[PDB]
Design a protein around this ligand. Sequence first.
Ligand SMILES: [Mg+2]
Ligand SMILES: [Zn+2]
Ligand SMILES: [Zn+2]
Ligand SMILES: [Zn+2]
Lengths: 163, 93, 141, 628, 298, 100, 353, 49
Amino acid sequence: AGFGMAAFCGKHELSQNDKQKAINYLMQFAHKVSGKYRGVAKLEGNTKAKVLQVLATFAYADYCRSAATPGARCRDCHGTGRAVDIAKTELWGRVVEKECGRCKGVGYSRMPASAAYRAVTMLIPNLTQPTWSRTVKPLYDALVVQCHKEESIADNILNAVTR
Amino acid sequence: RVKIANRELEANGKVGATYSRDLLGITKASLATESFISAASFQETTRVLTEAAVAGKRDELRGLKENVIVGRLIPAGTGYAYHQDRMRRRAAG
Amino acid sequence: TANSGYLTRRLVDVAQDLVVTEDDCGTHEGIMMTPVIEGGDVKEPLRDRVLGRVTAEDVLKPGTADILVPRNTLLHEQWCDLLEENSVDAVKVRSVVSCDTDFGVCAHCYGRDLARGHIINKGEAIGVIAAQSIGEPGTQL
Amino acid sequence: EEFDAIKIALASPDMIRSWSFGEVKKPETINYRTFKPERDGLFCARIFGPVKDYECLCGKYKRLKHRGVICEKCGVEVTQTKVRRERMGHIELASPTAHIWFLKSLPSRIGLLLDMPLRDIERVLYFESYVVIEGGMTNLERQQILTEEQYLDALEEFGDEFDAKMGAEAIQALLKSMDLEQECEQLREELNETNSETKRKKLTKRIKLLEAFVQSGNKPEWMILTVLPVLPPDLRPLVPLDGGRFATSDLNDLYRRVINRNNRLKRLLDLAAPDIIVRNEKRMLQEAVDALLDNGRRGRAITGSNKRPLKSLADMIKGKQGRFRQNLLGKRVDYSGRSVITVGPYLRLHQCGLPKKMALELFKPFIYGKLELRGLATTIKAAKKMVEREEAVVWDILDEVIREHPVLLNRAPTLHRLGIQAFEPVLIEGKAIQLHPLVCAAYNADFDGDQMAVHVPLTLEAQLEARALMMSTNNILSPANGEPIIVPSQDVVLGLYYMTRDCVNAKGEGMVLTGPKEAERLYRSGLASLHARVKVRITEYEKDANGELVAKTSLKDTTVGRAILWMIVPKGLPYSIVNQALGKKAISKMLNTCYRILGLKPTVIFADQIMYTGFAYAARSGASVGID
Amino acid sequence: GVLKIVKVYLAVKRRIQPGDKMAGRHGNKGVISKINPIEDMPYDENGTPVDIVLNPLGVPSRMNIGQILETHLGMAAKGIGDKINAMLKQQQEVAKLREFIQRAYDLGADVRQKVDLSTFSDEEVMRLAENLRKGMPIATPVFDGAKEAEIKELLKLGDLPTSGQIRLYDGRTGEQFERPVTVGYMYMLKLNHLVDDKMHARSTGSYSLVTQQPLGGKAQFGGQRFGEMEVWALEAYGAAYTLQEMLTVKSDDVNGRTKMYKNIVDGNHQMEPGMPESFNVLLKEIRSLGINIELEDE
Amino acid sequence: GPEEITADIPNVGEAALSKLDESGIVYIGAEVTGGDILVGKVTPKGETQLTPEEKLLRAIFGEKASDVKDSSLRVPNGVSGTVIDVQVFTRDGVEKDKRA
Amino acid sequence: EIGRTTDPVRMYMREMGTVELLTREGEIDIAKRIEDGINQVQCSVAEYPEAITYLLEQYDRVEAEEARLSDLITGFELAREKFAELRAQYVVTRDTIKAHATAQEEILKLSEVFKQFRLVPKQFDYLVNSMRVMMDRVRTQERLIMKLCVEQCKMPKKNFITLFTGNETSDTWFNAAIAMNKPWSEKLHDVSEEVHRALQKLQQIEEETGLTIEQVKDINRRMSIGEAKARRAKKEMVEANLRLVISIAKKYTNRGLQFLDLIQEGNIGLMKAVDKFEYRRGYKFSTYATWWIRQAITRSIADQATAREAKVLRMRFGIDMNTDYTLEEVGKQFDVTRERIRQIEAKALRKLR
Amino acid sequence: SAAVKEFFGSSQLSQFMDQNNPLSEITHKRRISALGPGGLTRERAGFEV
DNA sequence: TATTGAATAAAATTGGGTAAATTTGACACTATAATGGGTTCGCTCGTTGTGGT
DNA sequence: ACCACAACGAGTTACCTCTCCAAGTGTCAAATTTACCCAATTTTATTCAATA
RNA sequence: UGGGAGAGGUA
Ligand SMILES: [Mg+2]
Ligand SMILES: [Zn+2]
Ligand SMILES: [Zn+2]
Ligand SMILES: [Zn+2]
């Protein structure tokens, strides 16, 4: 609820101080999930806390990355994700559209996890892309799909009291 | 500037420059101060901004008029401690 | 009123950046103060001409008492009465135009804060105070 | 947020295109059928931004779901409308044109940069005389300005050995072809041979300009404009009037003239127009750009339909009604009121009478905070309707908020620093501010219709500055001289003068009184007058060589009124300051002596008591004015 | 573009109150400071309290003595009207009323008009006395007026003190004022500078388009200007935080003033100031003039 | 659309329409005070300037393109007084109103 | 006198006072110079056989019955037999071009049979603009071969002009330049591949026009000086009539525009009146010029004040519905395309004809 | 109509009449102004006039 | 019994380009004679920048 | 070198109150976008096995 | 929306 409104309003940059609140809430959620996963709890307090905080910022930035991110819009569809078919409009006559072939309709270009991997491997260098793929990235897309659930339940608790 | 240059030149062992002080008027001194923002907000904004754009000046924001235009604490009164703290922070680091 | 307002604005802008940024600049320069005796009478006595200033050096005379005020003393009413009872006519006090400080003045070269009665605290906009003090009685002129 | 200095320089054409967001091509501001701005115009939403917050122009992406997309129906990026006052544009001028500041702001600095007369430079820019730029022969040295006759016969003489041009392109070619460091070393060479101070000052001015150009690192050909930047269209809005018609802005009109003449010059240049027509169009574009940058500088100012000259960008920067003096050095300010002032003769030196409706408007978010702290209001709208209906608990919370929260009272013109002072407000009925009578000298206020502004300090630091610096009890002495600004004026003065002044055979003369309390008893009972010469026993005090007060008692010869004034004179002052007829100078000397002996707080209490007894005894005197 | 206009006409009845500018015909202006009770007002030996108490210190340095002479002549006029009112309340005659009104009309030294009441009827004299019972109106021409001798003869006709000064008593203590006080009738005007029209306060309202500063005026609910001179006053005090909050959070700091409003509602008296939007406007205008000015990140 | 002069006003109590007539206009002789409504006017479907307290709530939830704005002629604050004359000037061509 | 003035309309009226007014004969012989210029460029493009085969392919392209001959030929029922005569001219200029005064008499006969073609102006300047872009292609080609002659020599290039003003097609000038052995010729062996590219370009252009380089070079020189004299006569005509522009723009002054803008739009209108002026109509110039001047000034001041092809052929031409539609109705309802629908109509006309 | 309405509406001497009392109306009608079209100018005049 | 360094498909993303749709600005619409314009001074004081002997 | 003319700028602070500020419609070449083709790269999963 | 002029007035 409050996590959903804070993360959404910090993503779309309104009341622009709840981004840090979303970082801290996702860090506490990482504290919650790190007890039931193997490769995350292999460190001490300060190091694991710092790398999970910067991983929370990276997962929130992966949630914050929209079609209005500076340097992330699709070059062809201009963010829309909808192009016209000249051939199908010629053989049909009716107005028809297709999925944008470049960005596959999502509108923008998503953020790679290897930037986060390079940003965190300057503290712990012995973890590699096998370990990053088999251990870290399930936690990473778990956080971003969880923040999607948080946004959607904020949307449901909003349209239950407004509609 | 002449006094500071003569200070450091007689410190490191040079000859130093000689000068002759000039009594500017009140308007001419306000327009010939080394803060182009203060001089432009006083008077003759066309002339002052033209000369400052040609010379490529920069205002270091050391005066009360400059820190009022910018919207900060002035270096006077209760803002003086904050301004010398900011000066030692930008000088140490 | 129009002319005095324009004069006050010119004075504030010529003196806007002057702030007491030191306690003592460490100079020996001064201004020889004297009672103005222009015309046929004394116009301003030495007591109020020097009251609140800071002496550039000692006063040196055999005189009637051989009074030796120290260097850099804030002249209160007590020291004014001392100079009156010891009959002094020329005192050298540290002025603002002979201050050794760069980008501001020292507190000793200014002297007494006329609004509070003690020495001036470092960080007081004496240029704005002086410009308003000169440009206020222009309506009375 | 974090920045140290502010730098100023000339603007390169690549930098002018770098701030831009799209080239402005058409001069239409908005369509007048529907209120929608035209594409590539002065208000174009594809260039400057959408007119609604998170909504495209044609109405295709109206939600915040698309936080930015370029709507392919109308090209508009779906973002907030705050970017309309921040995104610039640019116009690509066909012929380059001179900047009017770097031409007609004396000294011209293009004529000073090239050692050319401004008359010759304007003759070149007005397409009247050619100027050579380079020449392979020795007959035509550089900057030799030729007329049309000399240009045609030199064309029949040499033809291709030289190349002379005209207009601002010639001056841009001259500035681009000049050599900065070579002119620097040549001028530093030529400085030594001359001996006249005028020629030497000219050489030092030119070498200072050249050294300033080299040390800044700009290029001298950036004084000739090839790209012209456009102000964002929410900083030059199209305000609608009450008739349905518009009062369009002067910047929109000047940009419209510049764009129309630039587009016509593009058409005449690609149409292969005659040289006279294309020179007239280039000259007109030069005049339009110069008008837009500074209307009244070069020729006659382009006036609008109302016979008034158009406000340019320089007219928006400079002057009393310009940006600095009207909106940057002084602003308009929230949490501030204004009312007519009256007398506060019952007040103390730190108090002012503030009306209840004025204070209820000034202190409204503090009232909302106290309402939501006490739980009386559930939400902000409930607190707002509670203040809108003005409950008795709203007036009680206002009484709680007002207490120990100073306000600043200010009267214009604020000539000296005691034109703003801080006071602790007293909630009064009525609509006028009540000012203490002893601060009216420092305010230069009377009560014939003066008004004062109230200002509420919000932050804790501002409240502490008002309490510790700007409080009226904190500045008793002037900042100009050391003398007190709190002098009693004319009614206190008339009352204390009538009090202390003696008479020879008034009533109850020659008595011997036990003290000032018996003198007050005699006067209030009616057995003695204020001016009866009488003998009372005055116990006066005196500070010793240390800080302790020694007491002494004697039989003084005085009047009854001086004995009653001794009841309010504090402990530490002698009877000699009371034992004469007190005028304005004597009361001011008494207050200054009380200051120098006792300090600040007994001086403030003494000034209050002086005001009260002077008012009371001037009233009991019954002084009047008759024709006799 | 107009469908219909509805024009409503209010009608306010405005009473005097403290704050209202009142004036006489001699440049004797001023503001009502207090509306006193009639038991508190000073009164004469007949118990009639005065209506307005004016300061005599406004007379000598301003030299408008026609104020005092109008006061004396108005006292004499109201004394004559009081005698006519006493005769009309006693319902005496028409002959004594005709005699007294004629005796009051023939008092001047060499006055031009000759008002003869023998040509008057009885109902005409009764109507004249019914219009004269509230005071006898007196024409005093400019540079042709009554003198002190005429004023004192009129005051002696009306059984009034010829010096124009009576004994007044304090309404509160009951005691007598020591010196005799000038009491009379002066013509006072209510000027159009009413404190209902001058009183205006604002907390937060609407803002200008370009500068994002508050508006100006009682009509559009604007804030008071904190001008250059007031900025100099705060600079001379040293009130840097007060000056900074005048410059930013009470003014053109759009993201700072909403923070300050919510901080005040949350009971936290602390601001977070930022850059003035008018300074951003000025930077954009100097950039539009073809001059690259920019803030420098150290 | 046109702005309507009408009796119904969104989001006011019955302490506002206590002095209006059936057409939205005030009665001749009504002892109104400050803040009362003399003639109610509502904008068409779509507001004209939105407050930031609910501008974010119209952004993230959706501007309804409905729920018209209160734009009524109110008595200014601190101003009492009766109403002595009303005059309605309608444009030539349309049917006016019952009160007009 | 130049100098102490700043009013730009005053400077315009001063600088326009140099020229003089024209008599009745002045428009006649300046129009004679105009006709001389356009007939000069017409006869210099008439001798080119590429223009002849271009007008023949234009003839059997318009003979496919997709457009009427009204917007092809104005005048001289006769165009068919005259184009058969032009085809006979084509086959005689194709078979006896090999032998050499027969080429001279046949190009002289092409130029005189070219002159009676009183065709429309737009197709004519479109086709000679196709000639213009191909001679601009060979112009930048010869400019490209001059700069590749210069860019590695670093010598006085005058001797290469003396050995290059011959035929400049074979390699005899190349061997005569390298073999004589001045100090550039031994280090000028790196030009061999680009001059061989120039030789294959020369054989390519020899087979694409059947004509050498010097004759097309001086014919391009002749048409360039012809169009230069035509443009100079147009400029000398249009500079001597700006007083008419000021006299017509004298009435529209305080109607929304500044005075100089009105006379600039009038100068544009006067230039458009000069460009399409006919002198065999009795009226001198002014009654034809004033319509264009008034039209430009009033227009400026008023401005300042398959399946898809089948259904757009239905809706645009109005085939079996209630109301017909123009390009704007379908350009609103179907897609934001406006003139693209017109090119769809053109493609459908091409695919149906 | 444009000329006379421009004058009578927005000249410098076509003034919004003061009618507080009858004295204000009679004094506004009996007023003489040294300023106006072709007269003096306010900031550009001194003690001589 | 397991987690992970190296290696590798492999599809998504960046960058470049490119031929075909598609905008975009202009132009048509036309022939008695006409041929050179309307717009501010009763402001002072001072300062700085320009031109002859 | 010194004098005699032109042009800019400045002139108190607020505060108020008012009024006043013609008709689309069809056609052409160019250039501009636009849907899309394809190498370089690189991010992510997936196999081997090899230490632990 | 809320700008710019002009006029008048107050201290
Ligand atoms: Mg006053
Ligand atoms: Zn896409
Ligand atoms: Zn010092
Ligand atoms: Zn759209």
